[model samples]
Target chain A: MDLTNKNVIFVAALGGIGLDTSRELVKRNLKNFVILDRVENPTALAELKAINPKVNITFHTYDVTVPVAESKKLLKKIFDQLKTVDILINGAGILDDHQIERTIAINFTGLVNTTTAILDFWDKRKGGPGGIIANICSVTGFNAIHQVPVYSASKAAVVSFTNSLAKLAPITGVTAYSINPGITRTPLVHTFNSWLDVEPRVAELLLSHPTQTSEQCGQNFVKAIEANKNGAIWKLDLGTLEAIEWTKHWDSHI
Target chain B: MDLTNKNVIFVAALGGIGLDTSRELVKRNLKNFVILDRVENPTALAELKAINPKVNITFHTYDVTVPVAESKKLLKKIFDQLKTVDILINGAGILDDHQIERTIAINFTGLVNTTTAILDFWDKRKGGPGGIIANICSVTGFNAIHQVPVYSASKAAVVSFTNSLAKLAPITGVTAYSINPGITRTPLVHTFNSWLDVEPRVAELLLSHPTQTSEQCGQNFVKAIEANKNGAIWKLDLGTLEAIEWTKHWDSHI
Candidate 1:
């Protein structure tokens, strides 16, 4: 699939990784974008425009926890504007272990709702252009973080959903996969101690582990999208891209 | 932990496995019970009394999707009445993939909220008697079911949460683990076709696979409680019990 002449819909592209990844995506020369987040980032939007002067971008205030009916309407509004969606990045996520319910609402349910919202628009079998759906997940999804139970579990939900959706890619032609990144230098990291109610000293375990810059993570995000394998889970850490492998057990074809 | 004189709290005990398990626990000679569910089951309660004539049981109308504050109050009421919670079974769940958000709300978020509801009472560190918390999950958590993406993901979230809580068990003395059951004959199974939006024939793959009766599942539920291992995920399928093992990678102490 050609990366040129495409419309990319990136949810929550105003944050750290989102900011860097948004810039990288515009460099690909995508003609249109639907950038949705709870709040808008003027500087981030300006940065994207500066990177590619002619790139078309639109921003919308979106709260993923909103009712399904409300979210569906907003998605329909975006699809009508973009006409054809070539790529979608479900990057709307909140990393807070203290707010367990809200975390799952955003990280897991939020991502699922965003993916289902695309419907047949991204499915070739439904007389629409085939596209890519890359869900931004976390390493905690695979390697459980005992300190932040809800946060880890929420991400695990994303990986599981990605796995199931991966199976649908062949029938739908809308390839689905997940990008699970490790410790990154993002604004969300600053609130890590409070998010999981762990001591700053305890948080050191994560920071002491191999960590990557948001710029590095964003770059790998693009690589995973470009690689375009259905049901694949890529781990972005320390500037390296590794596929997080899961061997199937008892059941076949799942 | 002695089974006699202990008080058991079963969430959503009106369902299939819940019904059988509730009876089995009564047979163990537990003195008191607080059964929480959307509705009460008179027949099941009557049968339990027949098995153990003097056992005390209280049924309450509880909805897991209710606000956290509201659910907390109900848990407190039950605790005040029963005075102690020796065993807690979070069995509240829905098997719908089409209603993705609702399914997760009940299966994952509902279970987590309920576990957290029993605070100092269940945690030994907080000057309370230590107890056991066994969450009811599905094999779909271990083996992803493509046809029912949300259901599989929701169960996976439960398993991940269980893993995290398992770590806390040593400190809190509230031994936390998960019981992952394979295909079972339950009321929820009848609606699975509509739940996942898959054809009835597609659902046959599950029917063709080895399945356990709800009674068998209930008996294993009792075994998991008696075995009492922190952070263990027990797989109950075809009347055989096995541990679902997860190998640790790169990081240590997670």
Candidate 2:
């Protein structure tokens, strides 16, 4: 997909997968991108600004768990500047370390708030089709893990929400896809270790495997966007794609 | 299944599916049961108490969202009187008609609180085996509906939470199952109608087809308990089940 001119919004772009994702997007020749972070001066945002001052990268320091009305007002300001977001990526999420409420707020409601705002804009486009919304879910969400119950639930909510929203994608002229990464090396990895019993080193090794990388995940995200695959869920570890064939087995366990 | 001698704790037994399910249990000649509800005087509890004065039924009005420590204290009081709770059913949920927070509190966090409390009890059990935990999730939770975003996400979280906890069912001697009932004719159904743009009557019809009667659903709950289907998610509506399964073909847009 020729995304050179596409305007993308990456929420939670401060560190971990989001940070690496922003770097990869810059390399992909996408000059128009915006990063939304809860922190004022995220290292990733700083590095991107230093690397390419002309990249038109904007930052919004806002908490997603705030009231929906307040979030709407904040997003309105961002929309006023960006005009329209072509590809929206919701990567904002807390890991196993955080409280269950916080996890739900950032990982699930955060995505809802941003997606709601973006759809408000996309729904208004007269004849042109709407854009794409990519949600970062997780493998833990797909099956289950004994350790991080709340985190897994939050991710699972993201996955199910994406699936349900995809049904209306055609009518709204927009598409929704959930990208479930098995494991990825990001700052958030430490959260999982501290919150749950999993070791940070082991988590990193799992993420570093060919199956889990920001660049590789980005490629999968690009494929879903180009194909407009609504309700599509992709899992990538290393370079090999797992569970590509959507089949009846989807509901076998659920 | 012969549940004559089993001691069951029915959380949120005051209303919705829980109340209806409790009635079914009464009809089945089950004498050892406890009713937990948030309301002071639930008609269902009152009615059940009237029928079996010596059925060993205890009613507790407690909030499930309280800190785990306090909630555990209350649970201990009940368990102290009852001795062993052979089965635990999490039927507490909310429609979130006006307050979205309430929905999240009761449906998502409430389940976690109760499950955590019960799990703690199970951990200390002398025989090393408890009974079962049946969480009533929803089809809406499995997929997203833009209108009821919070409710959908909350239910999805429950589904995930149940699955995660189910992994330990074998080791913990506690079988965990998630029951996702399609639209049932309950007080919550009215809330769903107002929340969605779909015609209330049509939406109700859609929710009902191959409609699972309250009694039938309750029987299904008993079925889940009898079979000890850990990590199993059963839906009331076949179409919704198929649609969830068909998510694999979502890219085709047929």
Q: Candidate 2's residue-wise lDDT over A1-254, tens digit each?
A: 46677778877766666665677676656657877778876565678877756678888777777776776787678778867667888887777533766776688777776666666567634454487888888776666444567877877777766775665565567778777776665566533542223234435443443445666766655555565567777775555454453333222111
Candidate 2 CAPRI grade: acceptable
Those runs of model 2 whose alpha carbons end farther than 4 Å from true positions after fitting are A41-43, A50-53, A125-130, A190-211, A241-254, B28-31, B50-53, B96-100, B124-131, B141-150, B170-173, B191-208, B235-254
Ten-residue region with minimum lDDT total, candidate 2 chain B: B245-254
Residue B92's C-alpha lDDT in candidate 2?
80
lDDT of all predictions: 0.79, 0.66
Looking at model 1, residue B133 earns an lDDT score of 88
Top model by lDDT, which number?
A: 1
For A85-182, candidate 1 gives per-residue lDDT tens digits of 77788888876677877888899888887777675456565676667888888888887767777888898888888887888666666778888888
Interface RMSD of 2: 8.5
Candidate 1 residue lDDT tens string, B1-254: 56788888889887998888887888888888778889877888888889898678888899998877787798778878777778888999887677887898899999888877775466665677877888998888876877788888898899888887778766677778888888888887755643224334545566776678999988988888888888888988888788877755335243
